[PDB]
């Protein structure tokens, strides 16, 4: 097509620039640094009380409270030190697929197959957890939501579009388009000005917040993008594919940097998270257990088994003290 | 080693017993995933008694039925089908009228794709058949050869229904774990609900036996 021929040339020089700017690979650069060695992680607490499968969880800001969502229809705010239950929120549609806990510790939000994102108060005059406002306007299933402030949130749904909301009014302040199908994951930068999201077409994109227009795209996968993370520094991120290939991309270099694949693993990653320093790249595999990878050496450094079913969510506290994984086993575990 | 944390422990133990009661109240209910390809076929079977998932619940013979309709969601099927892992049965309604109007070939796939899936490996599939009367009138002039070149029997309502029943049942790939209950829908309301209740009762007994291990 002559009309699409210009787009073909555009892709030509962008690929040429990406190829030319790669004067050296990371793997040969990180050769003189000592490996971290084997890592032993043990179960400190085990938390029971969920009955159905667990799909998502989010660590609090103080690294002491966490919230989990399950198909049982209950949203539980655990106390991560004494394994006590703080709140139990009964839901309306028991098809939740994501949850988020406010940076200020005041709000908790979840969404699922009903295409509705609900905001819950936690500190009210009465001793009850009520619904602040239900956000509607998505034609597909809601996949992942992450808070920005107490008045602005960003949501990712299955209708190919990400949106930025406004709890006070409830109307979509900004809408992000450009993906082709089933935007799965979402993660935002520490400075809360840019965020990235993974799509089912195996192509991650970077969206600005104030501008409201896409800034950059990344490709290289083969099947899907089940979950994404974002490097603590803010210039890179790690993305979890569906063919046992975790990838670490880059923002300044605008290229794929390194891959984390093994011959034994054949399943698909379900969740990805980082550590406080950034040396350990944690991933949650479909093969009944989690894993830890060296962000530089790209070699396995420990198998964190102990689950009787696939892990569906993984998170690391703000202070980097513990690691908590949730699985379809319905048992939530916190490791150290 | 607890000054005021005892009250917190009491609260956590009480919102544990409340959750246990709520979860033991949700095991008596039966969850049925409605499916199909034709919106008209769904209607007749959602009519009987009482965006995204549109739930509908009814009570029959002191049994609480929970029926989920999911067809509305216009997205990839493989990204949320596993959320229905524990459904008791999968109601499947297809059209008998549409043998010509390859539309049945379309359904035949949607049945193959749903039946022998990676999930649903131990869930029975109730098979409803709709528009049997219009099928009876329109089968006189339209031979099955247009859509079924392999048909060799006579052109009559009885033989065609049995042949299409056998054709639908042939696509099953796990004959020792599933049970495709087939029924022809009639104008009488009560019969459809009775067939649904009878099929569900049989599945419940088999599920109970699997837990104890009498197999």
């Amino acid at each position, epitope marked *: 097509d002559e009309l699409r021929q210009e787009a073909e040339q555009l892709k030509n020089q962008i690929r040429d620039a990406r190829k030319a700017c790669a004067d050296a690979t990371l793997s040969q650069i990180t050769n003189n640094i000592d490996p971290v060695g084997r890592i032993q992680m043990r179960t400190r607490r085990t938390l029971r009380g969920h009955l159905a499968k667990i799909y998502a969880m989010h660590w609090g800001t103080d690294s*002491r*409270l966490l919230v989990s969502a399950s198909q049982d229809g209950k949203l539980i705010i655990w*106390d991560s030190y004494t394994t*006590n239950k*703080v*709140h139990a929120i009964p839901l309306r549609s028991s098809w939740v697929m994501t949850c988020a806990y406010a940076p200020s*510790g005041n709000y908790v939000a979840c969404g699922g197959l009903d295409n509705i994102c609900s905001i819950y108060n936690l500190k009210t*005059r*009465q*001793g*009850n957890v009520r619904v602040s406002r239900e956000l509607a306007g998505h034609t597909g299933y809601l996949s992942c939501c992450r808070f920005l402030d107490d008045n602005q949130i960003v949501t990712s749904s299955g209708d190919t579009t990400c949106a930025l909301w406004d709890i006070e009014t409830g109307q979509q302040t900004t809408t992000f388009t450009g993906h082709t199908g089933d935007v799965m994951s979402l993660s935002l930068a520490p400075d809360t000005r840019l965020f990235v999201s993974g799509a089912c077409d195996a192509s991650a994109k970077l969206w600005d917040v104030r501008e409201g227009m896409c800034r950059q795209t990344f490709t290289g996968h083969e099947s899907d993008i089940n979950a994404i993370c974002f490097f603590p520094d803010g210039n890179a991120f790690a993305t979890g594919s569906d063919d046992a290939t975790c990838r670490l991309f880059d923002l300044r270099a605008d290229q794929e940097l390194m891959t984390y694949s093994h011959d034994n693993i054949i399943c698909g990653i379900t969740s990805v998270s980082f550590s406080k320093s950034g040396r350990l790249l944690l991933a949650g595999y479909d093969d009944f257990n989690c894993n830890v990878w060296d962000a530089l050496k790209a070699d396995r450094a420990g198998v964190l088994a102990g689950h009787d079913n696939r892990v569906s969510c993984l998170g690391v506290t703000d202070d980097g003290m513990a690691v908590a994984t949730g699985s379809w086993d319905s048992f939530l575990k916190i490791w150290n | *080693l607890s*000054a*005021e*944390d*005892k*009250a*917190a422990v*009491e*609260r956590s133990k*009480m919102i544990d017993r409340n959750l246990r009661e709520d979860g033991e109240k949700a095991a008596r209910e039966v969850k049925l995933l409605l499916l199909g390809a034709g919106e008209s076929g769904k209607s007749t079977i959602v009519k009987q008694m009482k965006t995204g998932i549109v739930e509908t619940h009814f009570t029959f013979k002191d049994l609480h039925f929970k029926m989920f309709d999911v067809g509305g969601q216009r997205s990839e099927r493989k990204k949320w089908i596993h959320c229905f892992e524990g459904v008791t049965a999968i109601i499947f309604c297809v059209a008998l009228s549409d043998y010509d109007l390859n539309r049945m070939h379309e359904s035949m796939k949607l049945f193959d794709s749903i039946c022998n899936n990676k999930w649903f490996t131990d869930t029975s599939i109730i098979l409803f058949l709709n528009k049997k009367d219009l099928f009876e009138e329109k089968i006189k002039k339209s031979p099955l050869t247009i859509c079924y070149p392999e048909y060799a029997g006579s052109n009559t309502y009885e033989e065609a229904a049995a042949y299409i029943q056998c054709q639908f049942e042939d696509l099953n790939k796990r004959k020792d774990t599933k049970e495709i209950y087939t029924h022809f829908t009639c104008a009488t309301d009560t019969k459809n609900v009775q067939f649904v209740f009878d099929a569900v009762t049989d599945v419940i007994i088999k599920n109970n036996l699997k837990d104890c291990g009498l197999f």
Partner: single-chain antibody
Amino acid sequence: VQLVESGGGLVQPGGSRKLSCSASGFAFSSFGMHWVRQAPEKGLEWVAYISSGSGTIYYADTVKGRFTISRDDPKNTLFLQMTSLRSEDTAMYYCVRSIYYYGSSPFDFWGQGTTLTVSSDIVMTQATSSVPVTPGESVSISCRSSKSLLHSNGNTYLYWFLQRPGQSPQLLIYRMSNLASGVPERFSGSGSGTAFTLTISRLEAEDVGVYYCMQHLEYPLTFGAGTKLEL
């Protein structure tokens, strides 16, 4: 968020009486309830405590056995059973709510009061009696405890209370550091070990009142002598 109580009056010594606390406007089926007694022109003193889903009915030692406390969740009403009558038995009775979780703030709301006929435990005490004030500068109030309140958890269980002249008191500082909800930021509490001090940045017209202290490390809850902050 309104506590209404009734049942007070003048009775002959040796009799019995019924006090009922009516709660409307909040989830009363999840708040632990206490009774607080204030002798005329004297300080405060704990009486009883009843938890949510009554399983702990902790009592004061001076009224142990004689008094009986119960609750009725569906009707949202608290009951108190008194028998006999002594000098210490009679005072003004208050109805206080409290909820206990990780980040809760016990002793949020207080009732109105009632009237009757006549006039070891960590003994928190300070009594600086009266402090004359001028609206504007900063005034500090000191308190001393009979035991180290710093539990192994890393937090001290002491509460600060303010009672303006003419109505029920309210909570200002819980765990000697955290501000209550709705109070002005001018208040500031601090201290460690057994030496605690409460400081006010600037004095206003409405700050005049009597300041009390609680310890919550172990029952029974012990009040202080109470310091009046007059002009």
